[PDB]
Design a binder for these strands. Structure first.
Ligand code: NA
Length: 290
DNA sequence: ATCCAGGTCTACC
DNA sequence: GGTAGACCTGGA
């Protein structure tokens, strides 16, 4: 694990001896949409019906608004703290072409997020800009999510399946999902009536999981890979969006290679570490606007 | 303006 | 199996 012990305080939990953990790298690498950077460098986020604030001071991480029981059963896995990222980076760095990207995002960790929230979040992500994606997700939450209080402000949890099933296509359009509104409505319908079961899909091996996710309207090869990587821990995923495409064309493939060929090339080369390789590549490419 | 952003769906050889 | 057009929105 990438930490050694924790200390439960009155208003938070302190995680000691943390390694491969930097706030900007984790929250701004593209994998999540409900974490917001604070003036002081901290980040406040909403996940699993809770508001959490995270601060990094030296080798210690302070997670506000949670206790030890919550750290053990929810947040330790949320931050993927049981995985040794030093080994991941060591293996990937054997490839000189990946070195610069790994060095740039040394503190990245792949969060273990909720399948339902992630499914809808990435359907919204298609042919969209992150700022807009964040707004749409928060609007959806404000419209039907549970009220949460933290430091004088009311935050809204992501809606339950039952509450989201109450949405009409127009409701999604109002939250500004654009043309994706119909996809979100259809998807929530299939989750609600049980046509597709997320717990079942998450239990499948990487390839079968990917195929089932593509059954959802609005989900293609890229969105499916994001969903299984970010909420189902299927690490052979290699989501090829515009940024990863650019990164791969700069290092491994020609400018006329299809996205499918790029995905297959990446998965073949990086294997079980494809998802991690993709994140370092994405973050470097987007931040440096290659 | 025309293109781009965490693409996907539809029509079609 | 592989491939041009259309598609909400809004900052550059
Ligand atoms: Na689909």
């Amino acid at each position: 694990m990438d930490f050694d012990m924790i200390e439960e305080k009155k208003d938070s939990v302190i995680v000691r001896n943390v390694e491969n953990f930097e706030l900007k790298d984790i929250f701004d690498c593209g994998q999540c949409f409900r974490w917001h950077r604070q003036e002081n460098g901290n980040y406040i986020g909403i996940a699993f019906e809770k508001v959490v604030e995270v601060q990094k001071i030296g080798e210690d991480v302070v997670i506000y608004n949670i206790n030890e029981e919550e750290f053990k059963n929810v947040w330790s896995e949320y931050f993927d703290l049981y995985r040794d990222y030093g080994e991941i980076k060591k293996e990937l760095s054997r490839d000189p072409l990946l070195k610069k990207s790994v060095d740039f995002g040394e503190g990245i960790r792949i969060l273990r997020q909720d399948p339902f929230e992630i499914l809808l979040s990435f359907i919204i992500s298609a042919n969209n800009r992150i700022p807009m994606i964040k707004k749409c997700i928060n609007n959806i939450s404000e419209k039907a999510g549970k009220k949460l209080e933290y430091k004088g402000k009311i935050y809204y949890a992501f809606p339950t399946v039952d509450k989201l099933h109450e949405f009409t296509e127009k409701d999604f359009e109002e939250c500004t999902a654009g043309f994706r509104a119909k996809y979100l409505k259809d998807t929530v319908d299939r989750i609600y009536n049980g046509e597709l079961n997320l717990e079942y899909i998450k239990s499948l091996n990487d390839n079968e999981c990917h195929e089932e996710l593509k059954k959802f309207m609005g989900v293609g090869p890229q969105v499916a890979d994001c969903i299984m990587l970010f909420s189902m821990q299927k690490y052979s995923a290699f989501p090829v969006d515009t940024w990863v495409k650019k990164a791969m064309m700069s290092l491994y493939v020609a400018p006329d290679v299809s996205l499918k060929k790029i995905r297959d090339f990446g998965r073949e080369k990086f294997g079980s570490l494809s998802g991690f390789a993709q994140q370092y590549l994405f973050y470097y490419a987007r931040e440096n606007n290659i």
